[PDB]
Amino acid sequence: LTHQQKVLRLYKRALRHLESWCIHRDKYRYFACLLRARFDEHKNEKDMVKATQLLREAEEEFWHGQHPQPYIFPESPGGTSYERYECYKVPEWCLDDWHPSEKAMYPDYFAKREQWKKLRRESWEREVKQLQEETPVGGPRTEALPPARKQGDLPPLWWHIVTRPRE
Amino acid sequence: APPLTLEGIKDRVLYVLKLYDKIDPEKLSVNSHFMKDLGLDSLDQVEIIMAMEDEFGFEIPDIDAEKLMCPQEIVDYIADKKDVYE
Amino acid sequence: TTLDPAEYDISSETRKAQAERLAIRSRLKREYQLQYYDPSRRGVIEDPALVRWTYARSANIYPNFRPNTKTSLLGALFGIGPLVFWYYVFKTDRDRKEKLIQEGKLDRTFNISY
Amino acid sequence: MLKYIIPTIMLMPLTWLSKNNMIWVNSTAHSLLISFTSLLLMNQFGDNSLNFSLLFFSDSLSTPLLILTMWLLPLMLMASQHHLSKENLTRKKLFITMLISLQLFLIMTFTAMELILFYILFEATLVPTLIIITRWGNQTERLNAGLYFLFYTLAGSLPLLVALIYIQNTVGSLNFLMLQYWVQPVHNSWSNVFMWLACMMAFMVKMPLYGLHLWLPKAHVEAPIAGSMVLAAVLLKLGGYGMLRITLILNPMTDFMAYPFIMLSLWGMIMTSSICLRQTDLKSLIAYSSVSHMALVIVAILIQTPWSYMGATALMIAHGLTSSMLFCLANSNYERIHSRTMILARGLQTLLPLMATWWLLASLTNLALPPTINLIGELFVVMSTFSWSNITIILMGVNMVITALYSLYMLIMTQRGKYTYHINNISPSFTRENALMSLHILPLLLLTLNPKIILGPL
Amino acid sequence: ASHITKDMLPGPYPKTPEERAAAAKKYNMRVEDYEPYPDDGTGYGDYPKLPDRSQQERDPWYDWDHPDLRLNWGEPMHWDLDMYIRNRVDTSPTPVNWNLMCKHLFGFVAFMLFMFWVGETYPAYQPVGPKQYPYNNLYLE
Amino acid sequence: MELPDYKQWKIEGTPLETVQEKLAARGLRDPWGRNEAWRYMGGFANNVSFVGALLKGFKWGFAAFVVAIGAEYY
Amino acid sequence: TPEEKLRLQQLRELRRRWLKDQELSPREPVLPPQRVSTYRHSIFAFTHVLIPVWIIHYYLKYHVTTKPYTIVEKKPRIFPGDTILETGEV
Amino acid sequence: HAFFKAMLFMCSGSIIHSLNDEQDIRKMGGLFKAMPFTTTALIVGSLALTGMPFLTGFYSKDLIIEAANTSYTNAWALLMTLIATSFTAIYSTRIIFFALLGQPRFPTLV
Amino acid sequence: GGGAHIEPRYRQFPQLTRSQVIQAEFFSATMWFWILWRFWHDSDAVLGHFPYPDPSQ
């Protein structure tokens, strides 16, 4: 977490916890530049304690008076009806055992099932070949080359490429 | 029950360009890249979606900042999150 | 109230060369994702963080154990401790309850049960 | 038993006498046919009493308890076939024959007509159980657990012989329980403590107190193919009932020293169920449920005067059917994920919908939902030990509190999702997996209509 | 079946840098605040050298957690510290302790002094003399 | 389909937006005011009233209350 | 950021490409298959309620004379006096 | 009382589906944003919950607070029951003043 | 979807179905007619009172 984006993650919530405190709509909006005016005091200066006293005293008057049960944006890490769609929950690839006369339905979806697996079943001669080469020894985050230099297949194939849709 | 298409997301993002008085209706449509006239540091990175913080605003996590420079890259993964077009 | 929980502190530049602790967990995740993706697995991965979690909790406490302290001899305040107290109560009842049952009466005429 | 032992020994030269893979269908076919004959002459009347034939049977008159002993050989063969079918037929013929050989001695036990016929059959087991523990388990800590299963049961049971032979040449002869009309009382002495204590302590080692339960999460944790003797070892624990045969008579007037057995087993009850909520091995989770509300009978036998024998009998076969099925719920769902760690089996309740009812109607019998055979059992024990002292409603009430939070913790660990792994776990709970999971609740809620069959004398 | 570094040993001073990590990567190079020194209170058989306990705690609350599985649902590789109390326990609140909850019931604890009196509607107070006299005076006439 | 075509709102009423006039001694100034004034203007100054809203205007407040009373009455 | 310019444009060529395959109704692919095959308010209503009242009455009238306590009805709660008696009151 | 909230949950249940989710007293607006019927049903039961001028449970509410008139109570009980009746009034206009009064403020696509 | 009989909006106030307002206005009239027996005729306390019974001698 760099000092450049240290204020920014506090800047998003400084207005976000404010709008749960208003009652009108303009009450927030009349306070918009007014809240920005204190934030626009120190504009361009050093990165040391000369300017860390913007942040080292931002603990008071932000944490002091911080969001008495704020708005929560209900599809979020918290908040009601966030992870609620779970009675369905999309159990993808549960279609292994059927004992058919139950594979009668969707004759075209089962037709298209065997087509996509060739990218899944055959990509290890290509993707895993460069995977020992592109990753030098033990380096940081394991995304591949973003086209994989000819055709990204994927590396995240297919669990991130065909993942569960929400409804 | 209401569905959605991809012709509505192209307009609302484009409209709140015109709703901001800092930006004229003379900038580019999909890629002005924000830096063309984006300023300064703060308040041109998170305030640029603070209007959509009220409108769309599904809590918009910390990764959403530096991807949002390319103004088409905003339009890219909103369709990925809310189970959108085909 | 349980607990503080210390959600902001300082840095910059107390031991700035502390980085690449992520290189440990990126190595594990590059090991895991290469393990997790394969066309024919049909079964779980071992993941011995669970194996060292059960076997260091189920066994390996008594081969560890030595009674060198008195905080493991503290258990006489916890094992035989309350069991002393429950005997003290139950013989004061059924004796004070007993003498009133014999010398004098307390229950009524319609006490067939019992 | 006129001849119940005589057909069930004839099952034994049928298995090896058979052909190839027909050996599973030939044994399970005829073994169900005894369940008519077991019911047939028994359950007769009924008012003082049914001495049955001879020196071999008092017919298990006022305590039936024996029909449940005969379900199991046609219940375990359908359960054991999951991971057994990789060995030789010469050993597959063995494991069926010693299992029948365990049912043979249990049939002459529980009836037994005597007290010295009881002991030699009380100890006639523990040889065919130990063969199922040592051979046919999983990885190690079988062998020490094979020795912890001995040396508690056998160290205690040898001072029975010193006391039972002592009675046989003191007052007549013990050979009949109906020559027990002449009984001299047993007063307070310094030798009559030990006569009471040695005759009692060998029963405590099987139905455990809070102390000396140290062998019970050893044999059940490391356990055969699919609970195959673990179903037997739960009957065998409640087949140490014979304290009901002894202590009703035969030193009747020693309640003077019941108190170190009361308080140890009444405070231990509130703790040994509390000590299980942090278990990480799933088969050891059930193994401490079997400690707790089995030890409620030990404060129900020593406290005499029925309205307890109404309930103390109904609790012996309360979790005779419940704790059997819970082991069968865990002998299944281990064939698919090869760990018994309760963390790992998440992402469930979507993949196997039909067995969600089998989890709940198991765990709804510990909550016990009063019209079952369970809260007709506890609420006679509660209304009994209330009349001992009023204060005992507290500990026994908190017993009811913690086991409510305890049973659901095993249910609610399967109501999660996204499963993260597991290209295996496909098998959608086949026809056998529901059949041997049935025939448990199908008699369990059936007998709640007229449960006068489940009662003592009383 | 893994036998090498199956679990801990009688520590926690058996050359702690060799433990985390031979396997069990609790520490990187034995200076990570989770080197297997933490046998807190020797003499208890619980938690030996143990790539285990008194490590930082109180709650993987499964929030945004966007690296991957990270927290509690999605199962990262080696992060188990102590559990079975942490799939149901969370983080810090707003204020702090100021136990006003016992002070909230203290208002009726002062009104337990109002339990000593009665609540008769007719008449009011008249609390200074014996003219009140709760019950009746003379007889018939 | 494209109903919020721009140059439509263009602040003329919405007395909430006179607060941007209030900061003329402060100055921000231009960006932006047309967000909260999306539906502040329009026909959305209906804005139901005082106790007459829970009276619903006292519309049928005494309607058949006096119309029923009364005859016979001899 | 220059790195994910190449990324996530092929992801829509993988995610939405599968989601192109995912919306699937060609020629109604539920078969189901085989086989075949307001006003009344007549047979739906009469089957529900009218039949058990015939049943549950039959275990009631044949029951008060068998069990030595039937329904345990209370008294009439009378002020004056008439009914099936004769007694009168002021 | 049984006719109150099974109405009133179901009355507001039409509202939560109407915005498809918020269930917050913030971000609502006024009463008549094409909501004629249920706002009329809101101002009956929330007027019943005021304390019954002539409504439904007037024969249950008034007859009990005037059954505590002459009583041998705690004398802090009537200083706790009748004060709670005043607090029941601000229950009413709160959902009026946030969901049924103000200017329409909520994210779009009505 | 299948039927768009109530269209979505961009804050242009989609209206009612021109019959819902009839049932809406009908059930404000049935309650303010029901203020009849609140006043006519029902008073505050129809009990009668005591005229300060001081002369008891």
Side-chain angles (χ1 to χ4, degrees), chain E residues 77 82-83 86 90-93 95-100 102 104 107-108 110:
Chain E
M77 193 64 198
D82 198 359
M83 205 178 292
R86 296 288 188 268
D90 266 15
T91 196
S92 37
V96 101
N97 55 48
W98 290 98
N99 294 320
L100 191 61
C102 66
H104 190 80
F108 190 76

PDB file of all heavy atoms in Angstrom, chain E residues 77-110, unseen atoms left out:
ATOM      1  N   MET E  77      -3.551 -22.059   1.217  1.00  0.00           N
ATOM      2  CA  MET E  77      -2.720 -23.252   1.343  1.00  0.00           C
ATOM      3  C   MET E  77      -2.270 -23.551   2.772  1.00  0.00           C
ATOM      4  O   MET E  77      -2.606 -24.607   3.314  1.00  0.00           O
ATOM      5  CB  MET E  77      -1.504 -23.129   0.433  1.00  0.00           C
ATOM      6  CG  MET E  77      -0.740 -24.425   0.259  1.00  0.00           C
ATOM      7  SD  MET E  77      -1.742 -25.676  -0.566  1.00  0.00           S
ATOM      8  CE  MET E  77      -0.828 -27.151  -0.150  1.00  0.00           C
ATOM      9  N   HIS E  78      -1.517 -22.651   3.397  1.00  0.00           N
ATOM     10  CA  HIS E  78      -0.986 -22.885   4.740  1.00  0.00           C
ATOM     11  C   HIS E  78      -1.161 -21.630   5.589  1.00  0.00           C
ATOM     12  O   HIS E  78      -0.248 -20.806   5.681  1.00  0.00           O
ATOM     13  CB  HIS E  78       0.479 -23.300   4.673  1.00  0.00           C
ATOM     14  N   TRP E  79      -2.326 -21.492   6.225  1.00  0.00           N
ATOM     15  CA  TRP E  79      -2.611 -20.350   7.084  1.00  0.00           C
ATOM     16  C   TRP E  79      -3.393 -20.706   8.343  1.00  0.00           C
ATOM     17  O   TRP E  79      -3.904 -19.799   9.009  1.00  0.00           O
ATOM     18  CB  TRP E  79      -3.370 -19.278   6.293  1.00  0.00           C
ATOM     19  N   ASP E  80      -3.510 -21.988   8.689  1.00  0.00           N
ATOM     20  CA  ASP E  80      -4.287 -22.385   9.859  1.00  0.00           C
ATOM     21  C   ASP E  80      -3.513 -22.094  11.133  1.00  0.00           C
ATOM     22  O   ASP E  80      -2.414 -22.617  11.331  1.00  0.00           O
ATOM     23  CB  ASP E  80      -4.632 -23.870   9.784  1.00  0.00           C
ATOM     24  N   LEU E  81      -4.087 -21.267  12.008  1.00  0.00           N
ATOM     25  CA  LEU E  81      -3.360 -20.856  13.203  1.00  0.00           C
ATOM     26  C   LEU E  81      -3.994 -21.406  14.469  1.00  0.00           C
ATOM     27  O   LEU E  81      -3.366 -22.179  15.202  1.00  0.00           O
ATOM     28  CB  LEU E  81      -3.303 -19.330  13.281  1.00  0.00           C
ATOM     29  N   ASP E  82      -5.236 -21.019  14.726  1.00  0.00           N
ATOM     30  CA  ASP E  82      -6.104 -21.759  15.622  1.00  0.00           C
ATOM     31  C   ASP E  82      -7.527 -21.457  15.204  1.00  0.00           C
ATOM     32  O   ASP E  82      -7.860 -20.329  14.836  1.00  0.00           O
ATOM     33  CB  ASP E  82      -5.901 -21.441  17.108  1.00  0.00           C
ATOM     34  CG  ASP E  82      -6.496 -22.510  18.009  1.00  0.00           C
ATOM     35  OD1 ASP E  82      -7.074 -23.477  17.484  1.00  0.00           O
ATOM     36  OD2 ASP E  82      -6.378 -22.399  19.242  1.00  0.00           O
ATOM     37  N   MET E  83      -8.364 -22.479  15.265  1.00  0.00           N
ATOM     38  CA  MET E  83      -9.608 -22.443  14.540  1.00  0.00           C
ATOM     39  C   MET E  83     -10.663 -23.020  15.475  1.00  0.00           C
ATOM     40  O   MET E  83     -10.444 -23.096  16.687  1.00  0.00           O
ATOM     41  CB  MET E  83      -9.401 -23.189  13.214  1.00  0.00           C
ATOM     42  CG  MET E  83     -10.313 -22.799  12.074  1.00  0.00           C
ATOM     43  SD  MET E  83      -9.889 -23.719  10.591  1.00  0.00           S
ATOM     44  CE  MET E  83      -8.286 -23.017  10.214  1.00  0.00           C
ATOM     45  N   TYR E  84     -11.850 -23.323  14.928  1.00  0.00           N
ATOM     46  CA  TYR E  84     -13.045 -23.822  15.620  1.00  0.00           C
ATOM     47  C   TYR E  84     -13.631 -22.819  16.615  1.00  0.00           C
ATOM     48  O   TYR E  84     -14.632 -23.113  17.272  1.00  0.00           O
ATOM     49  CB  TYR E  84     -12.782 -25.162  16.318  1.00  0.00           C
ATOM     50  N   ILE E  85     -13.026 -21.645  16.733  1.00  0.00           N
ATOM     51  CA  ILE E  85     -13.606 -20.510  17.433  1.00  0.00           C
ATOM     52  C   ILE E  85     -13.649 -19.299  16.520  1.00  0.00           C
ATOM     53  O   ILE E  85     -14.056 -18.211  16.931  1.00  0.00           O
ATOM     54  CB  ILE E  85     -12.807 -20.215  18.717  1.00  0.00           C
ATOM     55  N   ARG E  86     -13.226 -19.488  15.274  1.00  0.00           N
ATOM     56  CA  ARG E  86     -12.949 -18.409  14.344  1.00  0.00           C
ATOM     57  C   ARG E  86     -13.776 -18.479  13.067  1.00  0.00           C
ATOM     58  O   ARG E  86     -13.702 -17.554  12.255  1.00  0.00           O
ATOM     59  CB  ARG E  86     -11.466 -18.434  13.984  1.00  0.00           C
ATOM     60  CG  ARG E  86     -10.524 -18.158  15.132  1.00  0.00           C
ATOM     61  CD  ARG E  86     -10.555 -16.703  15.538  1.00  0.00           C
ATOM     62  NE  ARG E  86      -9.518 -16.397  16.516  1.00  0.00           N
ATOM     63  CZ  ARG E  86      -9.699 -16.442  17.829  1.00  0.00           C
ATOM     64  NH1 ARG E  86     -10.882 -16.776  18.321  1.00  0.00           N
ATOM     65  NH2 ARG E  86      -8.701 -16.149  18.650  1.00  0.00           N
ATOM     66  N   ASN E  87     -14.645 -19.473  12.999  1.00  0.00           N
ATOM     67  CA  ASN E  87     -15.653 -19.522  11.954  1.00  0.00           C
ATOM     68  C   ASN E  87     -16.953 -18.869  12.541  1.00  0.00           C
ATOM     69  O   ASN E  87     -18.022 -18.916  11.929  1.00  0.00           O
ATOM     70  CB  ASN E  87     -15.904 -20.956  11.501  1.00  0.00           C
ATOM     71  N   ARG E  88     -16.835 -18.260  13.730  1.00  0.00           N
ATOM     72  CA  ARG E  88     -17.917 -17.587  14.442  1.00  0.00           C
ATOM     73  C   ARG E  88     -17.366 -16.672  15.562  1.00  0.00           C
ATOM     74  O   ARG E  88     -17.592 -16.924  16.748  1.00  0.00           O
ATOM     75  CB  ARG E  88     -18.901 -18.606  15.013  1.00  0.00           C
ATOM     76  N   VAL E  89     -16.639 -15.624  15.152  1.00  0.00           N
ATOM     77  CA  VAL E  89     -16.032 -14.605  16.026  1.00  0.00           C
ATOM     78  C   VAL E  89     -15.468 -13.483  15.141  1.00  0.00           C
ATOM     79  O   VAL E  89     -14.716 -13.760  14.208  1.00  0.00           O
ATOM     80  CB  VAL E  89     -14.898 -15.176  16.898  1.00  0.00           C
ATOM     81  N   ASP E  90     -15.795 -12.223  15.425  1.00  0.00           N
ATOM     82  CA  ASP E  90     -15.306 -11.137  14.561  1.00  0.00           C
ATOM     83  C   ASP E  90     -14.437 -10.006  15.161  1.00  0.00           C
ATOM     84  O   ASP E  90     -13.898 -10.114  16.265  1.00  0.00           O
ATOM     85  CB  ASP E  90     -16.456 -10.556  13.715  1.00  0.00           C
ATOM     86  CG  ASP E  90     -16.554 -11.200  12.331  1.00  0.00           C
ATOM     87  OD1 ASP E  90     -15.944 -12.270  12.124  1.00  0.00           O
ATOM     88  OD2 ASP E  90     -17.243 -10.637  11.453  1.00  0.00           O
ATOM     89  N   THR E  91     -14.334  -8.919  14.396  1.00  0.00           N
ATOM     90  CA  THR E  91     -13.498  -7.755  14.708  1.00  0.00           C
ATOM     91  C   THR E  91     -14.024  -6.666  15.663  1.00  0.00           C
ATOM     92  O   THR E  91     -15.095  -6.796  16.256  1.00  0.00           O
ATOM     93  CB  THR E  91     -13.052  -7.084  13.389  1.00  0.00           C
ATOM     94  OG1 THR E  91     -11.958  -6.188  13.632  1.00  0.00           O
ATOM     95  CG2 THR E  91     -14.210  -6.328  12.763  1.00  0.00           C
ATOM     96  N   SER E  92     -13.233  -5.594  15.775  1.00  0.00           N
ATOM     97  CA  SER E  92     -13.477  -4.431  16.638  1.00  0.00           C
ATOM     98  C   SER E  92     -14.655  -3.557  16.231  1.00  0.00           C
ATOM     99  O   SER E  92     -14.924  -3.387  15.046  1.00  0.00           O
ATOM    100  CB  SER E  92     -12.220  -3.569  16.689  1.00  0.00           C
ATOM    101  OG  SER E  92     -11.579  -3.565  15.428  1.00  0.00           O
ATOM    102  N   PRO E  93     -15.329  -2.965  17.230  1.00  0.00           N
ATOM    103  CA  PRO E  93     -16.515  -2.122  17.079  1.00  0.00           C
ATOM    104  C   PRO E  93     -16.209  -0.641  16.931  1.00  0.00           C
ATOM    105  O   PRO E  93     -15.133  -0.263  16.473  1.00  0.00           O
ATOM    106  CB  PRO E  93     -17.245  -2.351  18.402  1.00  0.00           C
ATOM    107  CG  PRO E  93     -16.145  -2.577  19.391  1.00  0.00           C
ATOM    108  CD  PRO E  93     -14.920  -3.049  18.642  1.00  0.00           C
ATOM    109  N   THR E  94     -17.171   0.185  17.332  1.00  0.00           N
ATOM    110  CA  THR E  94     -17.046   1.631  17.253  1.00  0.00           C
ATOM    111  C   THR E  94     -16.252   2.207  18.418  1.00  0.00           C
ATOM    112  O   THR E  94     -15.061   2.485  18.291  1.00  0.00           O
ATOM    113  CB  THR E  94     -18.430   2.294  17.247  1.00  0.00           C
ATOM    114  N   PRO E  95     -16.924   2.391  19.561  1.00  0.00           N
ATOM    115  CA  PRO E  95     -16.407   2.939  20.825  1.00  0.00           C
ATOM    116  C   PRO E  95     -15.536   1.974  21.627  1.00  0.00           C
ATOM    117  O   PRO E  95     -14.662   1.313  21.065  1.00  0.00           O
ATOM    118  CB  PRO E  95     -17.683   3.232  21.617  1.00  0.00           C
ATOM    119  CG  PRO E  95     -18.683   2.264  21.086  1.00  0.00           C
ATOM    120  CD  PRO E  95     -18.365   2.097  19.631  1.00  0.00           C
ATOM    121  N   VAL E  96     -15.761   1.926  22.939  1.00  0.00           N
ATOM    122  CA  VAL E  96     -15.028   1.021  23.820  1.00  0.00           C
ATOM    123  C   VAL E  96     -15.714   0.819  25.160  1.00  0.00           C
ATOM    124  O   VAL E  96     -16.241   1.758  25.752  1.00  0.00           O
ATOM    125  CB  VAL E  96     -13.572   1.458  24.081  1.00  0.00           C
ATOM    126  CG1 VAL E  96     -13.449   2.138  25.437  1.00  0.00           C
ATOM    127  CG2 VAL E  96     -12.658   0.246  24.016  1.00  0.00           C
ATOM    128  N   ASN E  97     -15.676  -0.433  25.604  1.00  0.00           N
ATOM    129  CA  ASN E  97     -16.214  -0.924  26.874  1.00  0.00           C
ATOM    130  C   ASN E  97     -17.200  -0.073  27.684  1.00  0.00           C
ATOM    131  O   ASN E  97     -18.281  -0.542  28.043  1.00  0.00           O
ATOM    132  CB  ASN E  97     -15.041  -1.299  27.780  1.00  0.00           C
ATOM    133  CG  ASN E  97     -14.065  -0.154  27.964  1.00  0.00           C
ATOM    134  OD1 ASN E  97     -14.465   0.971  28.258  1.00  0.00           O
ATOM    135  ND2 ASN E  97     -12.783  -0.432  27.786  1.00  0.00           N
ATOM    136  N   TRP E  98     -16.837   1.178  27.961  1.00  0.00           N
ATOM    137  CA  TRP E  98     -17.677   2.015  28.808  1.00  0.00           C
ATOM    138  C   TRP E  98     -18.952   1.223  29.061  1.00  0.00           C
ATOM    139  O   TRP E  98     -19.939   1.385  28.337  1.00  0.00           O
ATOM    140  CB  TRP E  98     -17.984   3.368  28.166  1.00  0.00           C
ATOM    141  CG  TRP E  98     -16.811   4.308  28.082  1.00  0.00           C
ATOM    142  CD1 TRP E  98     -16.014   4.521  27.000  1.00  0.00           C
ATOM    143  CD2 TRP E  98     -16.314   5.171  29.119  1.00  0.00           C
ATOM    144  NE1 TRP E  98     -15.042   5.448  27.296  1.00  0.00           N
ATOM    145  CE2 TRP E  98     -15.206   5.864  28.590  1.00  0.00           C
ATOM    146  CE3 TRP E  98     -16.693   5.419  30.443  1.00  0.00           C
ATOM    147  CZ2 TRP E  98     -14.474   6.789  29.336  1.00  0.00           C
ATOM    148  CZ3 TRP E  98     -15.962   6.344  31.184  1.00  0.00           C
ATOM    149  CH2 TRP E  98     -14.867   7.015  30.627  1.00  0.00           C
ATOM    150  N   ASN E  99     -18.933   0.382  30.094  1.00  0.00           N
ATOM    151  CA  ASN E  99     -20.017  -0.563  30.364  1.00  0.00           C
ATOM    152  C   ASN E  99     -21.220   0.211  30.878  1.00  0.00           C
ATOM    153  O   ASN E  99     -21.480   0.262  32.082  1.00  0.00           O
ATOM    154  CB  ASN E  99     -19.583  -1.617  31.375  1.00  0.00           C
ATOM    155  CG  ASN E  99     -18.501  -2.516  30.843  1.00  0.00           C
ATOM    156  OD1 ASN E  99     -18.529  -2.917  29.682  1.00  0.00           O
ATOM    157  ND2 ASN E  99     -17.533  -2.838  31.688  1.00  0.00           N
ATOM    158  N   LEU E 100     -21.959   0.818  29.958  1.00  0.00           N
ATOM    159  CA  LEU E 100     -23.191   1.506  30.289  1.00  0.00           C
ATOM    160  C   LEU E 100     -24.366   0.537  30.346  1.00  0.00           C
ATOM    161  O   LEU E 100     -25.456   0.919  30.781  1.00  0.00           O
ATOM    162  CB  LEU E 100     -23.434   2.627  29.266  1.00  0.00           C
ATOM    163  CG  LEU E 100     -24.506   3.712  29.420  1.00  0.00           C
ATOM    164  CD1 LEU E 100     -24.274   4.546  30.664  1.00  0.00           C
ATOM    165  CD2 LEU E 100     -24.518   4.605  28.192  1.00  0.00           C
ATOM    166  N   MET E 101     -24.148  -0.722  29.950  1.00  0.00           N
ATOM    167  CA  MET E 101     -25.218  -1.716  29.944  1.00  0.00           C
ATOM    168  C   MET E 101     -25.612  -2.113  31.362  1.00  0.00           C
ATOM    169  O   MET E 101     -26.801  -2.262  31.666  1.00  0.00           O
ATOM    170  CB  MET E 101     -24.787  -2.943  29.140  1.00  0.00           C
ATOM    171  N   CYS E 102     -24.626  -2.300  32.243  1.00  0.00           N
ATOM    172  CA  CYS E 102     -24.935  -2.468  33.659  1.00  0.00           C
ATOM    173  C   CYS E 102     -25.444  -1.164  34.247  1.00  0.00           C
ATOM    174  O   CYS E 102     -26.257  -1.164  35.179  1.00  0.00           O
ATOM    175  CB  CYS E 102     -23.702  -2.955  34.421  1.00  0.00           C
ATOM    176  SG  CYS E 102     -22.341  -1.770  34.480  1.00  0.00           S
ATOM    177  N   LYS E 103     -24.981  -0.039  33.703  1.00  0.00           N
ATOM    178  CA  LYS E 103     -25.514   1.252  34.110  1.00  0.00           C
ATOM    179  C   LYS E 103     -26.919   1.473  33.564  1.00  0.00           C
ATOM    180  O   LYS E 103     -27.675   2.280  34.116  1.00  0.00           O
ATOM    181  CB  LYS E 103     -24.579   2.370  33.654  1.00  0.00           C
ATOM    182  N   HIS E 104     -27.284   0.775  32.486  1.00  0.00           N
ATOM    183  CA  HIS E 104     -28.632   0.914  31.950  1.00  0.00           C
ATOM    184  C   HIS E 104     -29.651   0.262  32.873  1.00  0.00           C
ATOM    185  O   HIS E 104     -30.741   0.802  33.092  1.00  0.00           O
ATOM    186  CB  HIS E 104     -28.713   0.299  30.555  1.00  0.00           C
ATOM    187  CG  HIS E 104     -29.987   0.608  29.837  1.00  0.00           C
ATOM    188  ND1 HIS E 104     -30.202   1.806  29.193  1.00  0.00           N
ATOM    189  CD2 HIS E 104     -31.125  -0.109  29.691  1.00  0.00           C
ATOM    190  CE1 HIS E 104     -31.411   1.806  28.660  1.00  0.00           C
ATOM    191  NE2 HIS E 104     -31.994   0.659  28.952  1.00  0.00           N
ATOM    192  N   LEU E 105     -29.308  -0.901  33.433  1.00  0.00           N
ATOM    193  CA  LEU E 105     -30.181  -1.546  34.407  1.00  0.00           C
ATOM    194  C   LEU E 105     -30.037  -0.922  35.785  1.00  0.00           C
ATOM    195  O   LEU E 105     -30.838  -1.208  36.681  1.00  0.00           O
ATOM    196  CB  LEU E 105     -29.879  -3.041  34.475  1.00  0.00           C
ATOM    197  N   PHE E 106     -29.027  -0.068  35.971  1.00  0.00           N
ATOM    198  CA  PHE E 106     -28.863   0.628  37.240  1.00  0.00           C
ATOM    199  C   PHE E 106     -29.955   1.666  37.461  1.00  0.00           C
ATOM    200  O   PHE E 106     -30.181   2.094  38.599  1.00  0.00           O
ATOM    201  CB  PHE E 106     -27.487   1.289  37.301  1.00  0.00           C
ATOM    202  N   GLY E 107     -30.625   2.094  36.387  1.00  0.00           N
ATOM    203  CA  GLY E 107     -31.738   3.019  36.529  1.00  0.00           C
ATOM    204  C   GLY E 107     -32.910   2.414  37.274  1.00  0.00           C
ATOM    205  O   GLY E 107     -33.586   3.094  38.049  1.00  0.00           O
ATOM    206  N   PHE E 108     -33.167   1.123  37.055  1.00  0.00           N
ATOM    207  CA  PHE E 108     -34.194   0.469  37.855  1.00  0.00           C
ATOM    208  C   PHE E 108     -33.634  -0.006  39.186  1.00  0.00           C
ATOM    209  O   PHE E 108     -34.400  -0.255  40.123  1.00  0.00           O
ATOM    210  CB  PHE E 108     -34.828  -0.700  37.097  1.00  0.00           C
ATOM    211  CG  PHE E 108     -36.055  -1.260  37.771  1.00  0.00           C
ATOM    212  CD1 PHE E 108     -37.260  -0.585  37.700  1.00  0.00           C
ATOM    213  CD2 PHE E 108     -35.996  -2.436  38.501  1.00  0.00           C
ATOM    214  CE1 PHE E 108     -38.390  -1.084  38.328  1.00  0.00           C
ATOM    215  CE2 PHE E 108     -37.124  -2.933  39.137  1.00  0.00           C
ATOM    216  CZ  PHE E 108     -38.321  -2.256  39.045  1.00  0.00           C
ATOM    217  N   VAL E 109     -32.310  -0.128  39.295  1.00  0.00           N
ATOM    218  CA  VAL E 109     -31.706  -0.439  40.588  1.00  0.00           C
ATOM    219  C   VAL E 109     -31.909   0.724  41.546  1.00  0.00           C
ATOM    220  O   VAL E 109     -32.106   0.533  42.752  1.00  0.00           O
ATOM    221  CB  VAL E 109     -30.215  -0.786  40.420  1.00  0.00           C
ATOM    222  N   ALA E 110     -31.884   1.947  41.018  1.00  0.00           N
ATOM    223  CA  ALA E 110     -32.330   3.088  41.804  1.00  0.00           C
ATOM    224  C   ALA E 110     -33.842   3.077  41.982  1.00  0.00           C
ATOM    225  O   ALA E 110     -34.344   3.534  43.015  1.00  0.00           O
ATOM    226  CB  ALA E 110     -31.872   4.389  41.148  1.00  0.00           C
TER     227      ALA E 110
END
